[PDB]
């Protein structure tokens, strides 16, 4: 239970929560905007995963201001969570290499 692994776990949990809330809130923001496609929850959940991973195929996206604000929160949550996982991996590798050198 080192700090970086704990923060990775917390980040994963928070990211899942952000995906669920982002899905629900994107549907709430986008309904009422003619032409909007991000308007049912299953595909909104798929879109939130797309957005958080940055693997944005372009099949779905928000057209409203509040839908795009929701999108930005999902983007930042995903990108920073994955950066935090990378940082935790770096810390683990650094510690293990320090032990391997006997420092």
């Amino acid at each position: 239970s080192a700090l970086h692994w704990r923060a990775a776990g917390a980040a994963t949990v928070l990211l899942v929560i952000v995906l669920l809330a982002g899905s629900y809130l994107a549907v709430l923001a986008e309904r009422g905007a003619p032409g909007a496609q991000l308007i049912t929850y299953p595909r909104a959940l798929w879109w939130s995963v797309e957005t958080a991973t940055t693997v944005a195929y372009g099949d779905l996206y928000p057209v409203t201001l509040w839908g795009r604000c929701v999108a930005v929160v999902v983007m930042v949550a995903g990108i920073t969570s994955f950066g935090l996982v990378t940082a935790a991996l770096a810390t683990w590798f650094v510690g293990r290499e320090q032990e391997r050198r006997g420092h």
């Epitope: 549907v27 905007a33 308007i39």
Partner: antibody, heavy 118, light 106 residues
Framework: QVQLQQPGAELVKPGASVKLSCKAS????????IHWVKQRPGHGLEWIGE????????NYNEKIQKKATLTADKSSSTAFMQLSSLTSEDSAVYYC???????????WGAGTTVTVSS | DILLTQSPAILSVSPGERVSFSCRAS??????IHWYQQRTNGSPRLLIK???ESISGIPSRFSGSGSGTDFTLSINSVESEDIANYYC?????????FGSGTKLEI
């Protein structure tokens, strides 16, 4: 059990208003949307609007003259549609329908026949 | 706003035959089309969701097909209880819209 309960009929004088109700039973989810659909005698189905009761936000058909105002009471699982200042063009059966946020109307109420007449 | 064209507006068929209702979307909408039956003085009843998915309690004579702009509701072996108006409805873009309906006659 019947999932959506609507009164059978409402008589409204021209110019007056009426509040239709739709009491829901069965499974209730935060993702539930309640929709309202107008059907004039011998005509098709016309979407009026929707409301998400867990948040109270309502959206309306932009193509038609706005005569409805949608509200919901979460404590009694009942959705209301206030139709305001009616003419005979507003005489119709008004259905409510429940959509689980996945785009289709899984269940419909029996419909309230609204007659606008003196 | 997506226009759903149902034509012909009336279909006449002999008992026991296969019948197909047409629904055409003004733009491509994947499989986001749902089909409802409304008998005289009745409420609409969902028959088929997402173009081809069965609904519990609906007779297996009902099926659906198509994707993009062209969709078909089919009844294998029509019988008298199938006399009704049939409506398609799209959920691909806001607002949801309905077709103008096709009447089945036997």
């Amino acid at each position: 059990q019947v999932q959506l309960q609507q009164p059978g009929a409402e008589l409204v004088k021209p110019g007056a208003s009426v509040k239709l109700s739709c009491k829901a039973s069965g499974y209730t989810f935060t993702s539930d949307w309640i929709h309202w659909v107008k059907q004039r005698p011998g005509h098709g189905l016309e979407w009026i609007g929707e409301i998400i009761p867990s948040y109270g936000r309502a959206n309306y058909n932009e193509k038609i003259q706005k005569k409805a105002t949608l509200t919901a009471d979460k404590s009694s699982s009942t959705a209301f549609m206030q139709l305001s200042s009616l003419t005979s063009e507003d005489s119709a059966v008004y259905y409510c329908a429940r959509e689980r946020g996945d785009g289709y109307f899984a269940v419909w109420g029996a419909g309230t026949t609204v007659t606008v007449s003196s | 706003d997506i226009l759903l064209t149902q034509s012909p507006a009336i279909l006449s068929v002999s008992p026991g035959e296969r019948v197909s209702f047409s629904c055409r979307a003004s733009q491509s909408i994947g499989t986001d089309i749902h089909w409802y039956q409304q008998r005289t003085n009745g409420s609409p009843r969902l028959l088929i969701k997402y173009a081809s998915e069965s609904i519990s309690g609906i007779p297996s004579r009902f099926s659906g097909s198509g994707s993009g702009t062209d969709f078909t509701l089919s009844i294998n072996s029509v019988e008298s209880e199938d006399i009704a108006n049939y409506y398609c409805q799209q959920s691909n873009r806001w607002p949801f819209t309905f077709g103008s309906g096709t009447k089945l006659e036997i």
